[PDB]
Amino acid sequence: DLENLYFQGSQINQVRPKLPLLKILHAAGAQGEMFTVKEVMHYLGQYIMVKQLYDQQEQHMVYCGGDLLGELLGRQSFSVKDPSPLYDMLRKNLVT
Numbered sequence: 900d901l902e903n904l905y906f907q908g909s910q911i912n913q914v915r916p917k918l919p920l921l922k923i924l925h926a927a928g929a930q931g932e933m934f935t936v937k938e939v940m941h942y943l944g945q946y947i948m949v950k951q952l953y954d955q956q957e958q959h960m961v962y963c964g965g966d967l968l969g970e971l972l973g974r975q976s977f978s979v980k981d982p983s984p985l986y987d988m989l990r991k992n993l994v995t
């Protein structure tokens with residue numbers, strides 16, 4: 900089966916975060932250094948919640964400036980409604 904052959908070694912698609920992003924996931928309670936992209940998103944959400952980087956009024960708004968997360972994103976702020984910067988950062992900080 901060629902479809903089986905193609906997908907072998909590639910059915911979970913784990914990533915190894917680059918060291919600064921790994922430190923963020925660890926601060927949100929992650930362990931080890933291999934994750935699914937779904938796990939990375941869970942831990943990043945948790946990180947923002949535990950470091951209180953969101954705005955209690957406009958909870959879609961993240962103020963990451965002066966946090967390690969802001970350094971990785973190259974931003975002072977972002978909205979979960981317009982998550983382009985997060986896509987960019989994860990493309991650069993997740994290794995297959």
Ligand SMILES: COc1ccc(C2=N[C@@H](c3ccc(Cl)cc3)[C@@H](c3ccc(Cl)cc3)N2C(=O)N2CCNC(=O)C2)c(OC(C)C)c1
Pocket residue numbers: 940941943944945947948953958959960961979982985986
């Ligand atoms: C209107 O209020 C909302 C609405 C949605 C999100 C959100 N939306 C989820 C989400 C957003 C963008 C992408 Cl690309 C993926 C997932 C996910 C998330 C995951 C990673 C990051 Cl870096 C930020 C947010 N994410 C969350 O982490 N949420 C889910 C909703 N409530 C929560 O308890 C936490 C949200 O996130 C806060 C952490 C800012 C707040």
